[PDB]
Ligand binder design. Structure first.
Ligand code: NA
Ligand code: NA
Length: 157
């Protein structure tokens, strides 16, 4: 009833490689809210702006017991460098095989260059303590986005 997106059951058990060398799974986050934001490329202007915006709001997400994960298909080492340079205090998922991206249907196609071109569409989701995807933002506008996600989280929580 309250889900806006249905994930395959296996999605919740995928090993997600994080910055810093550990793995997590979505099921491992049971019992608390989770914000998952997908972005197309480490260390680019929009992705850096977005990450810094979430980072600045961490204490507000903490107040709500929520955790955040950023996701792109960059490598663990790329993510480590990005986190260190920017000072991010939340993890980044290295979804190199786009398994998590496909589950959330964020790999979108565009007819461009006389080709069918597939890429990550900037998107964010709110996952409830019981693993339901209860809100989505697609084709995300970075300006104001982290603030809007925090507001929605508070309203849902
Ligand atoms: Na960087
Ligand atoms: Na959760």
């Amino acid at each position: 009833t309250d889900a806006v997106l249905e994930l395959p059951a296996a999605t919740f058990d995928l090993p997600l490689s994080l910055s810093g060398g550990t793995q997590t799974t979505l099921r491992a986050h049971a019992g608390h809210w989770l914000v998952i934001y997908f972005y197309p490329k480490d260390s680019t202007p929009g992705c850096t702006t977005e990450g810094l915006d979430f980072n600045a709001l961490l204490p507000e997400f903490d107040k709500a017991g929520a955790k955040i994960l950023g996701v792109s298909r960059d490598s663990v080492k790329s993510h480590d460098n990005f986190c260190a340079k920017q000072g991010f205090a939340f993890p980044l998922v290295s979804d190199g095989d786009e398994a998590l991206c496909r589950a959330f249907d964020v790999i979108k196609e565009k007819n461009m260059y006389g080709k069918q071109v597939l890429g990550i569409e900037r998107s964010t989701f709110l996952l409830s303590p019981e693993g339901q995807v209860v809100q989505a933002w697609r084709k995300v506008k970075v300006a104001g986005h982290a603030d809007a996600v925090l507001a929605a989280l508070k309203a849902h929580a």
